[PDB]
Amino acid sequence: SMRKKIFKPEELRQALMPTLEALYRQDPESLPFRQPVDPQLLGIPDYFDIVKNPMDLSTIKRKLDTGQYQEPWQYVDDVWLMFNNAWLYNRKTSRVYKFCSKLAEVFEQEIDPVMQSLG
Ligand SMILES: COc1cc(-c2ccc3c(c2)nc(CCc2ccccc2)n3CCN2CCOCC2)cccc1=O
């Protein structure tokens, strides 16, 4: 027999929220990731020329809360997209690039026992 696994919106929320809460918990590391990057406020005019698909924690939280996700990999893709954007835009020696690498480290430690328990 062949089939694809179905997931309820509240089932996705309860299983994936600790991994997101773990990212939020990182202070000062998560502070630049909590809200969408605002180039005008940050004095980075070329941001949208480089980062074509912006992602942040508030969007991922709003999606997971309002049931905008269907599969667990959709959540993981969004989180990795947010990390990829900060690594692409920022210098390797910069505060945001280092904070990003720390968040990715926490996320890989948190998502591993969660995705294994999901299937
Ligand atoms: C994730 O990628 C980037 C992030 C940021 C970034 C975004 C928001 C930031 C921030 C940097 N620095 C601060 C100040 C808070 C803070 C303090 C001590 C350490 C880290 C953050 N916040 C929060 C407040 N801000 C004030 C201005 O309008 C917006 C809200 C800049 C550069 C490149 C990026 O691509």
Atom from ligand 1 closest to the CA of residue 85: 35
Experimental method: X-ray
> Under CATH, which number does the domain 1-119 receive?
1.20.920.10
Ligand 1: which residues within 6 Å by Cβ? 28, 31-33, 35, 37-38, 41-42, 44, 86, 89-90, 96
Structure-block tokens of residue 34 = 């909590």
Which residues, including other chains, have CB under 8 Å from residue 26's CB and lie 6 or more apart? 99, 102, 103, 106
Q: Where are the domains of the chain?
A: 1-119
Decide: residue 40, CB within 10 A, 0-12 exposed, 13-18 middle, 19+ buried: exposed
Specify the resolution in Å. 2.1
- Choice from 27, 29, 31 to test ligand 1 binding pocket (greatest atom count within 8 A of CB): 31
Rg for the chain, CA atoms, rounded = 15
